[PDB]
Amino acid sequence: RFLKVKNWETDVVLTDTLHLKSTLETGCTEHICMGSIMLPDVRTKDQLFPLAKEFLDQYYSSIKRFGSKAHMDRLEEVNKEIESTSTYQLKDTELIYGAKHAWRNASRCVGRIQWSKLQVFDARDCTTAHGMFNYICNHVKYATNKGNLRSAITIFPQRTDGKHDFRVWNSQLIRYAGYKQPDGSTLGDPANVQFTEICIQQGWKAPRGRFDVLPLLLQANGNDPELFQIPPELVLEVPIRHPKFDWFKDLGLKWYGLPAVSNMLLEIGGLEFSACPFSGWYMGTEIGVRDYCDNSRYNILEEVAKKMDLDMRKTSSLWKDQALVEINIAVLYSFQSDKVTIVDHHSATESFIKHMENEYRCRGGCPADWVWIVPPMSGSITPVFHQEMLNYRLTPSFEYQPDPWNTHVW
Amino acid sequence: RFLKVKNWETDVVLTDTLHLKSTLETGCTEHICMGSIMLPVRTKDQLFPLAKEFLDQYYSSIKRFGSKAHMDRLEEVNKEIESTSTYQLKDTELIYGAKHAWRNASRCVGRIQWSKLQVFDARDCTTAHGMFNYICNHVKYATNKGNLRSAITIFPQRTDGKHDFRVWNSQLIRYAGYKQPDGSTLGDPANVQFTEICIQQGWKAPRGRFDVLPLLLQANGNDPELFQIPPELVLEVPIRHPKFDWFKDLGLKWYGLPAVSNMLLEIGGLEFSACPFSGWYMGTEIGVRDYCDNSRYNILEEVAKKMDLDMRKTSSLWKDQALVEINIAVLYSFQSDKVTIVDHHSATESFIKHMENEYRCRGGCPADWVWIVPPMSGSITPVFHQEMLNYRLTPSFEYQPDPWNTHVWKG
Numbered sequence: 032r033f034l035k036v037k038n039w040e041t042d043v044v045l046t047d048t049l050h051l052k053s054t055l056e057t058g059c060t061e062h063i064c065m066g067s068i069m070l071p072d073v074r075t076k077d078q079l080f081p082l083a084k085e086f087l088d089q090y091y092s093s094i095k096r097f098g099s100k101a102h103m104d105r106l107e108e109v110n111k112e113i114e115s116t117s118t119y120q121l122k123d124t125e126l127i128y129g130a131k132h133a134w135r136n137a138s139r140c141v142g143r144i145q146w147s148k149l150q151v152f153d154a155r156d157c158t159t160a161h162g163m164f165n166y167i168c169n170h171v172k173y174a175t176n177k178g179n180l181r182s183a184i185t186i187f188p189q190r191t192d193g194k195h196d197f198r199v200w201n202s203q204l205i206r207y208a209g210y211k212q213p214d215g216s217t218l219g220d221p222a223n224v225q226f227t228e229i230c231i232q233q234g235w236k237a238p239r240g241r242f243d244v245l246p247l248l249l250q251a252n253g254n255d256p257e258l259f260q261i262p263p264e265l266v267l268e269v270p271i272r273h274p275k276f277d278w279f280k281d282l283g284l285k286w287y288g289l290p291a292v293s294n295m296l297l298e299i300g301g302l303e304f305s306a307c308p309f310s311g312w313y314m315g316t317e318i319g320v321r322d323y324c325d326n327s328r329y330n331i332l333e334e335v336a337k338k339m340d341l342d343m344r345k346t347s348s349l350w351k352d353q354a355l356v357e358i359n360i361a362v363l364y365s366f367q368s369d370k371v372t373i374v375d376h377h378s379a380t381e382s383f384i385k386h387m388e389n390e391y392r393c394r395g396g397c398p399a400d401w402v403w404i405v406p407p408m409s410g411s412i413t414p415v416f417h418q419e420m421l422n423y424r425l426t427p428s429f430e431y432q433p434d435p436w437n438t439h440v441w
Numbered sequence: 442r443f444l445k446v447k448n449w450e451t452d453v454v455l456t457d458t459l460h461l462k463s464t465l466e467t468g469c470t471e472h473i474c475m476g477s478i479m480l481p482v483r484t485k486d487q488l489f490p491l492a493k494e495f496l497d498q499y500y501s502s503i504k505r506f507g508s509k510a511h512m513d514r515l516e517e518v519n520k521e522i523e524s525t526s527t528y529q530l531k532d533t534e535l536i537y538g539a540k541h542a543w544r545n546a547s548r549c550v551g552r553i554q555w556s557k558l559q560v561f562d563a564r565d566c567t568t569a570h571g572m573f574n575y576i577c578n579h580v581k582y583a584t585n586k587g588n589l590r591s592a593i594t595i596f597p598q599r600t601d602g603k604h605d606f607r608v609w610n611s612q613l614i615r616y617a618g619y620k621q622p623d624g625s626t627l628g629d630p631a632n633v634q635f636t637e638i639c640i641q642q643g644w645k646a647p648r649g650r651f652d653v654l655p656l657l658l659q660a661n662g663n664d665p666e667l668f669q670i671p672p673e674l675v676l677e678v679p680i681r682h683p684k685f686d687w688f689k690d691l692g693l694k695w696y697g698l699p700a701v702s703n704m705l706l707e708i709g710g711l712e713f714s715a716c717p718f719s720g721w722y723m724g725t726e727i728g729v730r731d732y733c734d735n736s737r738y739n740i741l742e743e744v745a746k747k748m749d750l751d752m753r754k755t756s757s758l759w760k761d762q763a764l765v766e767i768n769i770a771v772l773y774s775f776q777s778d779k780v781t782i783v784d785h786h787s788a789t790e791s792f793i794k795h796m797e798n799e800y801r802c803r804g805g806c807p808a809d810w811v812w813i814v815p816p817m818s819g820s821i822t823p824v825f826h827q828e829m830l831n832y833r834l835t836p837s838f839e840y841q842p843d844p845w846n847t848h849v850w851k852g
């Protein structure tokens with residue numbers, strides 16, 4: 032019940048007790064492990080208060096005022112507001128805490144060593160899509176910082192009862208368009224083909240390129256969503272060149288500097304924030320391995336190897352592997368050359384082990400999802416591969432939520 | 442209950458019902474997943490239900506469920522248990538059992554081959570010398586001059602746990618590891634502890650970088666004995682690179698036959714503590730883990746140096762570049778010498794086909810993503826995007842403690 036994890040490269044053994052504070056369930060059972068599954072109605076008054084108490088209890092513990100008048104007062108104060116208004120509002124301090132700890136508890140995020148340096152933008156006074164646009168432009172500009180990226184989250188008003196949901200329909204704030212083409216294949220980004228279309232099907236005029244920055248589709252208070260174009264001057268992009276292959280430039284690749292995920296739900300003390308775009312900076316493999324080389328994406332492997340004139344006749348020449356590496360060397364080279372923040376998978380995984388040992392030390396553990404933490408290339412030469420991890424759900428948290436167009440009462 | 446898995450690259454969805462036949466536990470609860478944890482004396486009482494379920498499975502597979510042959514065999518096993526407190530498997534049952542232990546191995550990417558296992562019945566074996574003979578024949582048969590063939594050799598089952606047959610080697614063929622006084626390691630760091638035991642037991646070590654370890658064999662609970670595998674039975678492959686002429690000068694080689702010998706085979710409640718089995722290598726086993734793991738031969742740096750890479754910053758990905766070349770060389774050397782090997786692209790593709798086929802005919806295929814995804818280039822192999830369900834079916838291969846931690850020494 033007081034579990035241990037071993038690192039098999041170093042024989043370091045850490046002891047986990049934090050998992051006992053877990054509440055939400057994993058999807059696994061005694062007879063079956065679902066650890067590789069991608070994805071395994073309002074809160075009532077009786078539902079909401081224990082959730083609020085749990086949260087305030089951990090908040091006042093964290094500021095070392097557990098069992099204080101201030102604690103008991105605030106407990107009292109929220110309990111009465113709940114029975115009154117059937118919901119409650121967080122103080123700014125608790126909002127910031129809640130957001131930082133939702134990143135802290137994100138068992139799938141390799142970048143959590145940075146979790147306490149999160150910039151939190153309170154957008155709970157927002158009322159309109161135009162308002163949302165303004166807040167999102169300010170987020171983008173602040174986070175980008177002329178290439179010196181800074182972590183940030185912007186939090187819009189909380190769900191009241193599903194009727195007045197704030198939603199960012201984009202999956203990220205900045206992403207390239209994906210177009211069906213009569214020929215057969217797909218121009219731009221295949222992952223975004225449906226959304227690219229819903230934009231047009233809403234009224235967007237597409238330049239029909241391969242790297243068209245998508246418009247924002249913003250939903251305030253549950254109204255029909257609205258199209259907004261991000262000022263191009265706010266969208267930092269990196270031309271992709273290779274430090275030894277001149278011909279790499281001629282492939283015509285670029286990517287954006289700011290990874291800003293915008294379709295998730297932030298849960299704090301029972302309250303649900305359906306619109307909460309957050310952003311950090313990229314690990315190189317996210318772009319070079321997944322975005323460029325997933326067959327379901329830009330899938331440029333064949334073309335790169337072709338230009339390297341590798342032997343593509345058989346898989347055992349490992350031409351895919353060889354090209355995959357060059358591609359990722361190039362992504363890192365390009366961002367670094369342009370002084371845009373990026374981290375390689377060796378550096379980030381090493382940072383994460385240090386973060387793990389930190390969390391075990393000062394917190395008694397660190398929920399971690401091996402299947403997502405291990406990078407998508409060169410797994411076993413990174414230190415997290417040989418690191419046993421325990422995965423469990425802590426709150427406050429980031430949660431998945433349905434795509435709006437499947438739900439929204441049009 | 443029905444359970445679905447999605448391949449996110451192909452949007453193919455499969456439905457698992459086989460998990461319902463799962464008996465053993467995973468280590469996971471509804472509040473904690475132990476999916477990345479490496480590891481998460483039996484009486485007459487619990488044995489007959491274990492036997493019955495096995496025999497029910499066996500006779501279903503041969504389409505004779507509920508037949509007189511089925512019921513008589515049940516009765517026969519029952520009486521033998523009540524009388525002798527254990528029982529013996531028919532040859533047919535053993536063969537079925539061993540194949541299905543492999544079929545059930547959720548961490549094995551090579552299971553498309555499970556039905557083609559060559560099973561050697563060594564249950565008449567009584568001494569260490571006899572064990573050595575059986576194992577030599579296994580090695581010769583399996584190796585087949587480079588044309589590798591899957592095989593398992595099954596020694597007598599546990600009885601009171603005081604008379605175990607054990608192979609003390611983790612694999613039949615492995616290289617020795619020597620700790621030096623200056624803290625360096627000569628050979629395979631993975632085998633320093635076992636090497637030391639051998640030496641204590643009287644092995645005269647050559648003390649080179651690639652010394653094939655002797656067999657340390659334990660029969661019927663007696664003290665283990667040392668034997669040397671005849672060198673002409675040990676097929677080795679010098680490693681060279683197709684474009685890099687300096688690569689051969691690193692002086693590396695590896696053996697052709699992977700043969701795991703420290704696992705326990707469970708069939709119908711019976712425990713076979715010595716059951717060495719072998720197939721053939723996936724390249725990355727050697728080229729990624731054996732050569733490039735920091736706790737192994739760890740040749741990444743030397744290879745990178747000779748490629749003249751930027752080894753200053755890690756973001757130059759000199760490690761990733763060196764790793765690919767080392768793995769190219771491993772595949773190149775084996776194919777050139779006509780020794781059976783499979784690259785991780787071919788193997789993972791085959792496994793997906795196998796997995797789909799298994800859902801169709803069997804209602805599921807238990808699979809451990811953490812182990813199935815290759816240790817390099819994960820997401821450009823099709824298993825990365827494949828959701829999987831992990832559960833435990835019997836017959837099965839299980840882990841067991843190293844014998845030198847449990848053995849009672851005779852003298």
Ligand code: HEM
Pocket residue numbers: 133134137139140141142143145149182183184309310311312313314317374379403429
């Ligand atoms: C600052 C540097 C950061 C790095 C390098 C980083 C890196 C990563 C990576 C590589 C993944 C794997 C996901 C994928 O492959 O698509 C991930 C997942 C995730 N990250 Fe981080 N991240 C960073 C910052 C943040 C921040 C600021 C937040 C929120 C405040 C966050 C929250 C998450 C969440 C919730 C997931 C998993 C979501 C899911 O279940 O799919 N990350 N991160």
Ligand code: HEM
Pocket residue numbers: 543546548549550551552554558591592593718719720721722723726783788812838
């Ligand atoms: C014939 C070609 C085969 C290939 C290419 C293959 C491949 C692999 C690989 C790559 C692993 C991961 C192990 C690691 O990375 O340390 C594995 C695990 C495993 N294999 Fe296979 N294998 C083959 C044949 C067999 C046979 C013949 C058996 C048994 C009769 C078997 C039983 C197992 C078991 C029980 C494991 C799990 C070991 C553990 O849990 O630690 N395999 N296999």
Ligand SMILES: CN[C@H](C)Cc1cc(C#N)cc(OCc2ccc3c(C)cc(N)nc3c2)c1
Pocket residue numbers: 290291292294295309310311312313314317431432
């Ligand atoms: C094709 N695979 C899909 C896109 C998996 C995924 C789904 C969702 C959602 N909803 C959200 C996801 O976000 C992962 C994530 C979230 C935040 C990140 C930040 C802030 C930085 C960064 N470098 N990577 C992130 C990665 C991922």
Ligand SMILES: CN[C@H](C)Cc1cc(C#N)cc(OCc2ccc3c(C)cc(N)nc3c2)c1
Pocket residue numbers: 699700701703704718719720721722723726840841
């Ligand atoms: C340092 N990591 C350790 C060695 C993991 C491991 C432990 C054990 C045991 N006991 C058994 C193991 O077996 C894996 C295995 C088993 C059989 C294989 C066969 C038959 C062929 C092949 N190519 N690889 C195998 C790989 C692995």
Ligand SMILES: C[C@H](O)[C@H](O)[C@H]1CNc2nc(N)[nH]c(=O)c2N1
Pocket residue numbers: 039416417418419420476477478479811812813
């Ligand atoms: C900690 C982690 O579970 C451990 O290092 C596992 C991960 N996956 C693996 N996968 C394979 N094929 N072989 C291994 O030895 C391991 N080791």
Ligand SMILES: C[C@H](O)[C@H](O)[C@H]1CNc2nc(N)[nH]c(=O)c2N1
Pocket residue numbers: 067068069402403404449825826827828829
């Ligand atoms: C099927 C599998 O769960 C799926 O492909 C997962 C595997 N691991 C991952 N790991 C990361 N970091 N990101 C991902 O999208 C995925 N996808």
Ligand SMILES: [Zn+2]
Pocket residue numbers: 059063064065066469473474475476
């Ligand atoms: Zn699990």
